[PDB]
């Protein structure tokens, strides 16, 4: 039959022993597919990726004999894959992950003439990457995906990045960010754990630069509206006091409430943020409007305060203009 | 004559049938016809770019090693306990984002045998597939999510997938969706793609879905017109006591901003402008124009006779006669343009 | 004589009985009468169109191959570990949407064997069934949440389920429901449906659920008429405090808007018009009319005139409560069909 | 002599012991006394009518087939690997709403063997119990949550459950609960019941649990006190400042409506009246009446003789209302603290 | 010579080594050496009053039945798939609230054999420890969470645990924590407790945790100061028209109420008074005194010199009291 060759290959074969155990460390290469790069969540400091992991390594015991056909490639099923030897591999920054068994476990086997074999196990991942949340609206995040063996050591097993596709899919269509360059630097992250020695590593980063649209259109326009209402407050008669003060204090209340609500959405970082300082500048501008009107009223009650009021309403708008200009210039 | 012995001699230990061998090895590919049956949609929310479905799944193919000529009857079923004992295809969904089985009181899987040698195997599974939501015309949205079906451990030079031409994607009758609806026409094409390791068969099935306007229509568009009429009556209010109209305009602005913020949260974070944020922004700019018009008429009133007060009344009535017409015609453009 | 030997010779290797073949093969169908026992209802939701039940499930059928004549006693029980060694039905739930077993210290399974060959099998499972929730008259709603039971891998010409007539759906006493009570009478009809591969036996039990008015009634009806009478007392204010009156009116409009928004956000999005939404709309219309006619009376007062304005104000004061009361009476009579 | 040989001859292949047959088969019922060791409460929430516990569990019985006389020492510990090779009860929890083991580094299960054949079996499990909560006097709530412990496939004639009365509900020392402290008393009775398949044993324990008002005192009553004092300062203002006084009135009403809505969010939707809600609603009616009386006195103000009467009425209200609120507060607290 | 024959003759079927019996049976206990190595903290949340860590876990002991003298190399690894062929301890966690393994492409388990007879066995585990969280001085809090590593099915006289001295709890270098930085110093003590069924070995590892002020500092104290200076500018207004001053006071008290409501959404419900809440209460009392003072001066007006004098005295004295209380509170909760 056709299964006789594989059955004879597996009999008298020990999967408990890695190939060339007394020889040189075995050579492994990787081609990490990127199928569905899921949405990233700042509050969890995590993101989800769906990959088609691929590995290749020489295996002299797995040499397909030319007696049957001498096939360039041979294919068997996941049961045979479980029967054969496998290279162990755990994701370093992994925190929750599983397999896929929609009908059965997804494994592909290609067996070469030389003895090199190819396996591929699709497996969904949720990674962890410490976000540099500073300069939040203008950031280029570096979330890293790395592989390394656990049981075996560098003198026993090694990893190399194959000179091939690390990026794959072109129709990624990520919701928020976008990926242009996928360069591999700090590729070898050869890691030492005390009492164990050297462990081979292969590492890759994904460079994701956030766009601006949502934040630009969701917050900045309301801030500008609050500021222009404050400017109109500057353009009101100081004589009235039951209208100018209430609208200004309402504006500062609304601005502060919006600031608190928006600040509560991001993860509770422990240092200043660009959006934070933007909201702070807007809030102090509103408070400046209120205090200048109060001062105008105080001076009016027992020089004229009208000249001061018109000077303020003519000067501070330009102040806000070039202040936000400086803000955008310094953050870009 | 023992029924169990026929099963053993057909497949299993005392048969020579190696389940690790696909039918017709080292020869032509296998056609493997398949057809699905929806049972219940649901939990389709834009927050996660996905939807949950519960479907059946049946494969049809002919196995010469499974061909038999001992039972006089044509049809033949089998206990689901032996499903792993024979070869099965490796059908899998490219976009998965979570899937599982149903293991209630049994493994609810069905297999049937045809007299000639063709086989029928069915299984029910639950999927949560990623739906690439596009939110351009969100209130009037039209959206399709494709269920990628393909093989993994077999190149298309050896395994092929095809649909039954007669109702491959037949659907249940009583199903319904929350504020959505799926149209009857459902396209069916191919998706056979390539990889650095080879190429595999890939069949495709896509749906066309609509969302009923009613919910969003009422719940968000009603307050907009309410605030428009409130600004109109603010215009109708005379100008002697400033704080009255000042507070009315301030409250209208509060309504607009809070309603926009509330509309924002449910819809997922997106960069490109949506279809109803434009409504919210334009209503916000009308109320801003209302308060600015009041500020202008107040400035004209107190700049200092009543000749300019006559002009202030004239511009007040001009606004009162212009904003209704402008708002109506703008609504006509807005509604017409997104319905085409 | 030995119970272990007796069990092995009854079913297992040394029995000649194969668990993989349905009883009375190539003969009459198998009935397998089944009854269910509610043990904990509740955790019902509406945003996801489902409810969770933790129920028992007891099947009854007769297998002639299992007939024994050794033990004098009629009733006999077995270790649940023996269960996987004998034939089982493939009963599943159509509208399933997630369910699982319970493995606490044992797979909670009971097996009993009758002398003639009748067998009783039970299992405790927890389900999350999908219910076509309808919310036309949402505060005064009555719902029919259903469970469809059917086989999967057997045509109905080989297998057809029934229910024991003597209280097939017996229900525990201590169970109670938040914002719900189930009715004692429970309908029971058939649901036999067809598919492309044939037709399978389908059975179902439907439940009627009634939601108490109390919670919604108090907590969201009361602020409505509270603000309505706030507007009513706002009418009694005279023209001098026009900014005060307009501010309080617009703030009442704010209160109605935010209460309505909360009420809508509590309940999942639906296209067809609900019931209480007309209540929020009508209260918003009444407060809007109050503010509108206050503005109109101020305008006519600025533009003889005072007496007519006072007359229309008192007409409104005597009319608005009457219209509100007749509207409430109409609403309550029309939503008790 | 060999421990492996002794284990094989006691249970397993060369022992003649079948784990599928209960001790004293076709005879007297078996006694299974068990005790529950509490290790951690927590995550008790009213939103889903439940509480989560992580407890130990030890059963006690004496299978005559397990008797042995080889090792002189009475005690005998075993690897939980052998656990599947002996008979077990079918113990389960009625109202448990899904639970699981702990598979961390091993299956954390202990089995002990006594010289006479007595066997101790222990297993650590974590539960999520469904507690039929009652929330009538919820601010001062006192609760009775249970855990119905019962067998499943064995009737009166086959299996019984009792308690090791000496510390049956032995609880950990340093544990405590957020917004909860449990009393040392633990009641103990039987849920014994029947079904159409027969009758099964019960044992259960109920834990008296009460919620201390501290956090609820601060977050709930203090803001209401502040708003109502704002209402009396609204009284304290004159009549000519009509927009100011009335704006204070409606804004306090806004505070009240938002506070009433916020408190309702945490608790589940219950038809029957709660205890905090009446407080919030009645002092809401207080501030509403404040605005009502200010409007009424404005109407009275709008030849000049009635102004003095209006001022006198304002003084009477400003005096009486604090007294009414205080006497009502004492009345309500004495009702719901008894 | 043959690796398969060597493994079979060492452990398994044709070895006589039973995996159901602990080493040195009916003899001295196994001393055992166990150490941990952090890989990542994260998810310190007071809402659930627990936290999740991702750590390795290593044990050391000597099994006499595992003694071998064939392979010249001292250190020797083995296939993880044959872990179950040999005995292992039952090291579990006391308060753990549910975990799992990592099964990615293999059970990520490492086994090492020493020539003399020592064995190394390591498994990567992800925990979720319940911490007795305290919130008395919440913004300036110092936290100490513990992990009670111990055995379950073996008495103390039969089995004891111990720590390897050199860097027992060594941590990763570059890890960082939101809202937290752990100090380098970690204590180590025994927790050998008792039960009615006996007594067991028990070990502890406690982490000191300090939470940075920054987030709460800015997002809570800055708006409070803004509202206090809103109250100041309310004082600065003339008495004349009541509505402006009264409305400003109302807006400020609404800000206090809203901030007090929103502050506690993240923090868990706790009976004892917190530290931030007293700040909220005192600033609410400051603005309350401001509004009450304006009501009193309005009553006095409807003596104008006395009213303006007391207004000025309040305007000058209130900031002094605010500053002295501010300094007092900060020294109290900073020393
Ligand atoms: C890592 O090291 C191996 C050999 O030590 C080498 O073949 C490989 O190119 C290196 N990879 C990187 C990214 O430096
Ligand atoms: C169907 O299968 C037959 C035999 O395997 C093959 O000759 C034929 O080309 C297949 N059809 C397609 C469309 O691949
Ligand atoms: C099932 O019961 C019904 C009772 O009318 C009847 O068809 C027959 O007794 C049973 N059918 C079988 C055993 O196929
Ligand atoms: C314990 O002994 C037997 C066990 O079958 C039982 O009849 C008895 O009621 C039990 N309880 C006692 C003796 O208190
Ligand atoms: C192991 O046993 C105890 C417990 O740690 C310890 O004191 C002793 O020194 C160790 N060695 C021996 C031989 O007992
Ligand atoms: C489901 C339709 C209800 C319509 C109610 C109309 C009430 C008019 C007063
Ligand atoms: C070191 C930062 C102190 C806080 C600054 C806040 C600025 C608004
Ligand atoms: C790209 C930003 C558009 C904003 C429209 C209001
Ligand atoms: C269906 C067409 C509606 C047009 C409204 C202006
Ligand atoms: C169907 C669209 C209706 C729009 C009414 C203003
Ligand atoms: C049962 C509802 C009664 C309502 C009376 C106004
Ligand atoms: C124990 C109850 C105390 C209540 C104090 C107001
Ligand atoms: C029990 C809490 C008291 C708080 C006093 C400020
Ligand atoms: C870090 C807090 C500083 C406070 C100074 C008043
Ligand atoms: C004024 C604040 C000083 C704080 C010193 C720690
Ligand atoms: C914990 C000290 C509080 C002091 C309040 C004046
Ligand atoms: C379809 C909602 C009602 C419109 C008047």
Author numbering:
A (entry chain E): 33 to 334, 446 to 475
B (entry chain D): 8 to 311, 384 to 419
C (entry chain C): 8 to 310, 386 to 419
D (entry chain B): 8 to 309, 384 to 419
E (entry chain A): 8 to 309, 387 to 419
Wording from the paper:
A third structure (gly-3) was resolved in the α1emβem GlyR–glycine complex that corresponds to the desensitized state. Two out of five orthosteric sites had densities of glycine. However, due to the lower overall resolution (~4.1 Å), we did not explicitly model glycine, instead only indicated these two positions in Fig. 2j. The activation gate around 9’ Leu is open. The desensitization gate is constricted to a radius of ~2 Å (m pink), rendering the channel non-conductive. α1β GlyR in the apo and gly-3(desensitized) states, but not in the gly-1/2(open/expanded-open) states, retained 5-fold pseudosymmetry, despite that the ECD remains largely symmetric throughout the gating cycle. In this way, the pore is dilated in an asymmetrical manner, representing one possible open state of α1β GlyR. When desensitization happens, the intracellular end of M2 helices of all subunits collapses back into a more pseudo-symmetrical conformation that is thermodynamically stable, stopping Cl− conduction. We also note that limitations in resolution, especially in the gly-3(desensitized) state, might complicate the precise assignment of occupied sites. Nonetheless, the same compact conformation was observed across all five pockets, irrespective of whether glycine is bound.
